[PDB]
């Protein structure tokens, strides 16, 4: 009771001191005066205290406690000396009394905190006794209780919207303060068996899902789970997905990763086979927050080169080409397989396309060596090529052979790019025909045509040397037909503002190219192109509360620093 009274008194002094700063806000406090006021209650000033229990400075209390020890009753001896140690250590135990606290005013929050307080306690109790009921009835009760605990934890810290994963920042930081991860981690690494247990697998999956929820969109949670990265280096799917989710949109983490993670994932690919999850993790790590890391691309390219053709599986030879041809037919429809076969190849080629981005000569040379342009044109020109192939394949072609620090002249002299443009026109016509059925439109092909088909053309024509290539003078009708198809795509009413802006910019680029080459565009096309060219107090209180938390952390650090000599005394 005395300890709680001291805590209350110090908190009252603390809030009284911040009362002035609330009106003052410029914002700094007088830590020395607060420290002096706080240090007076503990004693040591030689005028006694009402908090003293004998009005004699504890002399009588000490005499009693020592005289309660030489008796032959062991419980009495234990109680007496425990009281002694608690008496001599009052200030530090008060310090850890602050080192625990939490809860600001708001709403049902009041009963949400009570609901989540005992769930973690019972989870800790079950984890401690997990070895007792583990299979090597109490077991079923523990299973259902922990399943409910994990489900509640996952669904209480997440603001479940219609189709957007929204996380409540306040709930995330409250769970951080409570220490949910500090028990779930030990739940992950309990000893178990995998041959004859499946409910354990369900609990393990729930734990992984809850960890992914706890780090969904929160930078602090990802940064704190970064210390326990060494526990997640497993060839399993769930560990890979968790490492993906804690690395999403994290530039500073991606900039500070040792090569151990990428080398471990490459070795996992080599041993446990080619899996989509590893490639997705590589995609997440290579580029973060829209910014590509040169060191990341260099290390992933070195890793894949060291791995060799075991990881890099290419269907270049006609013997493999025909197998790919008949395997596409099985790949048709909604047939993903979620791991083997062709989607791995797709994700690998998006990996190469993303790693090549940034005018990186080191990546560009390797990508050029791995896949020739003749193979690229033979792959794209085949009628079997579905838009799922085309998106990533054309993206990689554009990102490797156009956006280059050092240009290659083979893509500026060959005539197969006109065949590519013819294929693009065919895809544009197919999209325009698909526009008549909005209810069952092929969204993948429409997105491909709207973004990639004009993106590659714009990137190719942006270079000033593209106009210098006089190969188009014999194929002007192809260029005007491509422009007409792009504008017909612009005629669609399902254009996203991003898609509409991309199409308009590509039309502008084509018009600039025509002006540079003095190409006589159609009168109607020219006319239409010319026409186209022609919380107030609540948020403040919350921010002030975060300031209060930081300032009280600094304050308790200051008191601990100044009390260490008194504690030792």
């Amino acid at each position: 009771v005395r300890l709680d009274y001291r805590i209350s008194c110090l908190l009252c002094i603390f809030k009284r001191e911040f009362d002035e700063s609330n009106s003052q806000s410029p914002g700094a406090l007088d830590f020395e005066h607060i420290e002096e006021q706080a240090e007076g209650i503990f004693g040591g000033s030689e005028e006694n205290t009402p908090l003293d229990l004998d009005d004699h400075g504890g002399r009588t209390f000490l005499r009693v406690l020592l005289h309660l020890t030489m008796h032959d009753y062991p419980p009495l001896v234990s109680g007496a000396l425990q009281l002694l140690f608690r008496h001599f250590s009052q200030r530090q135990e008060v310090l850890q009394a602050f080192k625990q606290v939490q809860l600001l005013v708001t709403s049902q929050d009041v009963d949400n905190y009570k609901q989540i307080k005992q769930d973690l306690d019972q989870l800790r109790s079950i984890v401690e006794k997990s070895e007792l009921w583990v299979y090597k009835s109490t077991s079923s009760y523990n299973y259902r209780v922990v399943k409910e605990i994990l489900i509640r934890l996952s669904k209480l810290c997440v603001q479940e919207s219609a189709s957007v994963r929204k996380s409540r920042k306040q709930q995330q930081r409250l769970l951080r303060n409570m220490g949910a991860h500090a028990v779930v981690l030990e739940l992950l690494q309990i000893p178990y068996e995998k041959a004859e247990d499946t409910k354990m697998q369900e609990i393990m999956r729930l734990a992984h899902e809850f960890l992914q929820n706890f780090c969904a969109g929160n930078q602090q949670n990802q940064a704190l789970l970064h210390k326990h990265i060494n526990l997640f280096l497993n060839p399993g799917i769930l560990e890979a997905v968790t490492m993906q989710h804690i690395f999403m949109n994290n530039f500073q983490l991606c900039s500070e990763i040792n090569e151990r993670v990428v080398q471990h994932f490459v070795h996992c690919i080599e041993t446990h086979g080619r899996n989509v999850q590893y490639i997705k993790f590589l995609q997440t790590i290579v580029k973060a927050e829209g910014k590509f890391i040169k060191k990341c691309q260099d290390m992933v390219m070195a890793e894949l080169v060291n791995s060799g053709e075991d990881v890099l599986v290419f269907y270049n030879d006609r013997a493999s080409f025909q197998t790919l041809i008949q395997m596409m037919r099985s790949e048709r429809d909604r047939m993903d397989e979620n791991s083997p076969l062709f989607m791995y190849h797709i994700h690998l080629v998006e990996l190469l396309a993303v790693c090549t981005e940034g005018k990186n000569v080191y990546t560009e040379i390797k990508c050029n060596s791995l896949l020739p342009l003749d193979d690229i044109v033979r792959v794209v020109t085949h009628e079997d090529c579905i838009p799922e192939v085309k998106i990533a394949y054309i993206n990689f072609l554009n990102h490797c052979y156009v956006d280059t620090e050092v240009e290659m002249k083979e893509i500026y002299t060959s005539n197969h790019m006109w065949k590519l443009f013819e294929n693009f026109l065919v895809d544009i016509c197919r999209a325009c025909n698909n526009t008549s059925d909005r209810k069952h439109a092929d969204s993948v092909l429409e997105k491909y045509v709207t973004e990639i088909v004009m993106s590659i053309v714009t990137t190719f024509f942006s270079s000033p040397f593209s106009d210098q290539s006089t190969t188009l003078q014999t194929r002007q009708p192809v260029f005007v037909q491509l422009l007409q198809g792009v504008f017909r795509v612009y005629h669609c009413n399902w254009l996203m503002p991003s898609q509409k802006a991309s199409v308009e910019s590509c039309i502008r680029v084509l018009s600039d190219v025509a002006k540079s080459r003095a190409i006589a565009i159609p009168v109607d096309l020219d006319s239409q192109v010319n026409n186209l060219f022609l919380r107030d107090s609540v948020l403040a209180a919350s921010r002030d509360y975060r300031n209060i938390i930081e300032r009280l952390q600094d304050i308790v650090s200051a008191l601990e620093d100044r009390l260490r000599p008194l504690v030792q005394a």
Partner: peptide, 29 residues
Amino acid sequence: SPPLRQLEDHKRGEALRQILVNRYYGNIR
């Protein structure tokens, strides 16, 4: 200087220890 603060802390702790010993043992001559 950090030695100055260390000496200040040392003398504060020594004074606290002396006053606590005086309070507990009492005036013994």
